[PDB]
Design a protein around this ligand. Structure first.
Ligand SMILES: [Cl-]
Ligand SMILES: [Cl-]
Ligand SMILES: [Cl-]
Ligand SMILES: [Cl-]
Length: 230
């Protein structure tokens, strides 16, 4: 039961971990309730929240970085990836007493929402967890996209140059803050982008990015104060 939750999002599709979960949100925790696994995640465990559209024009994604990572049986998840039909909507009233709403939440939550599901979820997460929801910034690829196709290790994905980070989706998911970057290395009709980390923590290469995309990537990263050698 979840009668005690402030608000629940029922039957949400997560692509990682793969399955459908209810998301019961409380003042200091979220309970993820699946068919096989249930997990109580502290708000403190949520390091980052990213909301972005899929290349689809059908789906919207939300991504939560989790530390310590979520567990199901033996196996460990540093990122939760949730997926929504971009047009589905949610109408919901928060289960908060009026005085409790007024004392603690009047400036960061509404009592009633009626909006796209991912937008309601963003707002409730912001208000309850006090985290920023990161959205795609000024970067816009040669063909007016938020991201470029490439691979990390063998793994085909998309790299989003966000305003303050590199973000790779979806297998595996990686988030590298710019404040963790020592420098970038562009080597060669595709190119490889090496993100060298500070504190001798190594480097992460995003391989086989279209060459057409090099110049705008280079300029955006330099405008963000990163050392870009090519
Ligand atoms: Cl769905
Ligand atoms: Cl379920
Ligand atoms: Cl709680
Ligand atoms: Cl809103």
């Amino acid at each position: 039961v979840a009668g005690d939750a402030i608000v629940s999002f029922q039957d949400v599709f997560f692509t990682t971990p793969r399955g459908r979960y209810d998301i019961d949100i409380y003042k200091n925790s979220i309970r993820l309730r699946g068919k096989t696994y249930e997990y109580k995640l502290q708000h403190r465990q949520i390091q980052r929240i990213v909301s972005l559209p899929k290349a689809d024009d059908i789906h919207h994604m939300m991504v939560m970085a989790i530390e310590p990572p979520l567990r199901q049986g033996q196996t460990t998840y540093p990122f939760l990836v949730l997926q929504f039909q971009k047009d589905e909507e949610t109408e919901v009233q928060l289960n908060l007493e009026d005085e409790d709403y007024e004392e603690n939440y009047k400036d960061k939550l509404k009592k009633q929402y009626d909006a796209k599901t991912h937008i309601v979820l963003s707002h409730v997460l912001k208000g309850l967890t006090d985290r920023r929801v990161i959205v795609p910034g000024e970067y816009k690829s040669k063909y007016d996209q938020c991201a470029v196709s490439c691979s990390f290790k063998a793994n085909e994905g998309y790299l989003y140059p966000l305003d303050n980070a590199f973000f790779f989706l979806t297998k595996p998911t990686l988030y590298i803050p710019f404040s963790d970057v020592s420098m970038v290395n562009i080597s060669r009709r595709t190119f490889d982008l090496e993100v060298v980390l500070r504190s001798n923590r190594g480097s992460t290469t995003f391989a086989n990015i279209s060459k057409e995309e090099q110049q705008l990537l280079e300029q955006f990263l330099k405008s963000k104060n990163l050392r870009v050698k090519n």
